[PDB]
């Protein structure tokens, strides 16, 4: 029996995203009220708002934690066309300012021409990198060259998707046999545009991200995308939130030694398609092992999906808020 717990988020408007820290002891929430809030889990399992500040001049669409090796770093993105990076200064602020002051805005990334719809830190083995996607159809990848100086972020890569970008996912695979990959989703409502999920692979020879694949079977608007954590699989798994939940496996085809600079070709299979929300699916998230998928939709439910030992995916749980 899953126990739902209400948290009085005290946001003045709609909450767009919720992100846990790497240890699952802190969470960040972001809202149309232009604010980010941080919440800490006490030993009794209660949640307490430990910081609340205005971050942006428009609705905050996403919030993400960096890996704890880079310290206590948050990124937020907004309708105001910016992404902001925040660092928590852990220090003795004398016992009178426990309300709001330990999060410092280190930078504002302003290169995007329209709404920045999603923001994701890269896997830690790539360094302190931040991807942003914008409705202008561009993914921008920034790097902080010095973790001690989070005020400086260099634009390393610009990826033209040629579609309005709605969501991004880094492939978390630490395998040196796999070039760094990013999946990009599009919320474009045009029925004439097939392939609203695009996969980009970093090509070492060109020092650029090149389009490896396009999921032509995904013609519906994409609201969220997530690569599953790769704990020793010879293939990738990608979840896609659209009118339904889709799960794709992507097996890299062995590079025939004859294409001296090609992107990796993938053998792609749809291993699951679930219409059980009977409505649009807004979010998809993998467990840390990449074995259980959570999805949320307009049906007001969170659904849990898991493969059995025959690779048959099933709904294993439904959580409903009261």
């Amino acid at each position: 029996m899953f126990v739902a717990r209400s948290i009085a988020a005290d946001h003045k408007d709609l909450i767009h995203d919720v992100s846990f820290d790497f240890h699952g002891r802190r969470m960040a929430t972001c809202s149309s009220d232009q604010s980010v809030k941080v919440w800490d889990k006490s030993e009794n399992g209660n949640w307490h708002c430990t910081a609340s500040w205005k971050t942006h001049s428009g609705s905050v669409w996403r919030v993400t934690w960096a890996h704890p090796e880079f310290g206590q770093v948050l990124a937020s993105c907004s309708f105001d066309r910016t992404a902001a990076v925040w660092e928590e200064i852990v220090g003795e602020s004398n016992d009178k300012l426990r309300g709001q002051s330990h999060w410092v805005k280190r930078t504002t990334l302003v290169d995007s021409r329209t709404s920045v719809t999603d923001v994701k830190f890269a896997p830690k083995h790539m360094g302190l990198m931040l991807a942003t996607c914008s409705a202008d159809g561009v993914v921008r990848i920034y790097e902080a060259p010095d973790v001690m100086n989070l005020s400086q972020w260099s634009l390393q890569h610009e990826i033209s998707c040629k579609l309005s970008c709605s969501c991004i996912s880094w492939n978390p695979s630490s395998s040196r046999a796999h070039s760094p990959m990013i999946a990009v989703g599009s919320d474009d409502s045009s029925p004439n545009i097939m392939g609203k999920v695009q996969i980009y692979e970093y090509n070492e020879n060109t020092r650029k991200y090149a389009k490896a694949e396009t999921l032509m079977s995904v013609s519906d608007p994409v609201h969220d995308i997530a690569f599953a954590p790769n704990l020793g699989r010879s293939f990738h798994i990608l979840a896609v939130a659209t009118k339904d939940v889709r799960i794709f496996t992507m097996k890299p085809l062995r590079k025939e030694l004859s294409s001296s600079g090609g992107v990796t070709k993938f053998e792609i299979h749809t291993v699951a398609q679930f219409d059980n929300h009977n409505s649009q699916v807004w979010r998809v998230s993998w467990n840390i092992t990449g074995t259980v998928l959570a999805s949320s939709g307009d049906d007001g439910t969170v659904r849990l999906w898991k493969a059995n030992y025959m690779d048959n995916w099933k709904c294993i749980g439904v959580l409903k808020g009261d």
Binding site: E256, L257, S258, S259, S260
Partner: protein, 335 residues
């Protein structure tokens, strides 16, 4: 550069079979002797000074490698082409330049490595050897090409040679050196009796270098497939594998090596001086060194072949040396 630009403007476009044009304004003999002297001075300086070799090759205005390779495609005298190839060989002593020269040799098709189905008239060194050098009874271009290949093999061996144009590997150059140069050197006319041995030395030096550094790996005994233009083709085996395969079978190459050792000892048994003695002695020495490298690597090569799924049979070199010599009609190779 001025000679490269002038000689390239006069290359006939393939569509006009009808009008007698007046004689080519050829390089004068004095200009030829001047160009040869300049190339020989250039070769000598870059042969001894690595800093001069790098500084001349990287010179953005002169582009010496591009100009020299471009002149090799023009209709110039074979002596000038031979000195141009020696200048490239002297540049190819530095490993940084040698890797770029391998790519440039494949792009320029000075040796035809890509056979298109339909052209029955080959352009390049194989036709110059068979039509020009063979008529002059002198082989300076073929020797200078063997010297370039000998220097490039010593400084850099590229595994991906010809990747994207053909199946990767050295095999087209090995076929030219083996089948067109070495197996035919005895059947050719020579104005200088010594040059017969200079050609044999120059090709055997390349084979010795290719076999010296080659160690049998398990990967050499597996057929690797490479996609080219939408067809799967088998990749070429390393040149040392091909040399071992020909030396460990009843091949024309092994027979030619054994008969060169017989010709060598038969001339030495005269105790008389003869033209090209020093070059015959070296060519025989490279044949000995090849057989000795074969005997040293034979056990490992045969064990890996036996572990592999290749339908290839190979005979111990020591048993092939007991073969009937086709010349004496006796088993006298060991003698």
């Amino acid at each position: 550069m001025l000679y490269h630009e002038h000689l390239r403007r006069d290359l006939p476009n393939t569509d006009n079979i009808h009008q007698r044009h007046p004689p080519l304004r050829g390089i004068t003999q004095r200009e030829l002797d001047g160009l040869i002297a300049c190339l020989q001075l250039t070769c000598t300086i870059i042969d001894w000074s690595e800093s001069a070799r790098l500084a001349l090759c990287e010179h953005a205005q002169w582009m010496p490698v591009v100009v020299i390779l471009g002149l090799l495609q023009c209709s110039i005298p074979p002596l000038l082409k031979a000195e141009l190839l020696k200048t490239l060989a002297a540049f190819g002593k530095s490993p940084e330049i040698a890797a770029s020269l391998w790519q440039s040799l494949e792009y320029t098709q000075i040796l035809q490595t890509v056979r298109a189905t339909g052209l029955r008239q080959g352009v390049g060194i194989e036709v110059e050897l068979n039509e020009i050098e063979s008529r002059c009874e002198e082989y300076p271009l073929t020797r200078a090409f063997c010297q370039l290949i000998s220097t490039l093999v010593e400084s850099s061996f590229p595994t991906n040679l010809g990747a994207g144009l053909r199946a990767p590997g050295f095999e087209p150059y090995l076929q030219f050196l083996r089948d067109t140069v070495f197996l035919r050197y005895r059947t050719r006319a020579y104005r200088r009796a010594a040059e017969k041995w200079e050609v044999a030395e120059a090709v055997l030096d390349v084979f010795y270098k290719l076999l010296k550094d080659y160690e049998p790996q398990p990967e050499d005994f597996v057929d690797q497939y490479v996609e080219l233009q939408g067809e799967e083709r088998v990749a070429f085996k390393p040149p040392g594998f091909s040399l071992m395969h020909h030396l460990l079978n009843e091949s024309p190459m092994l027979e030619l090596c054994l008969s060169l050792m017989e010709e060598g000892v038969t001339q030495l048994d005269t105790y008389a001086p003869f033209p090209g003695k020093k070059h015959l002695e070296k060519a025989v020495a490279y044949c000995f060194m090849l057989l000795n490298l074969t005997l040293q690597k034979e056990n490992r090569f045969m064990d890996l072949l036996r572990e592999s799924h290749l339908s290839m049979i190979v005979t111990p070199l020591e048993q092939l040396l007991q073969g009937i010599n086709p010349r004496s009609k006796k088993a006298d190779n060991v003698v």
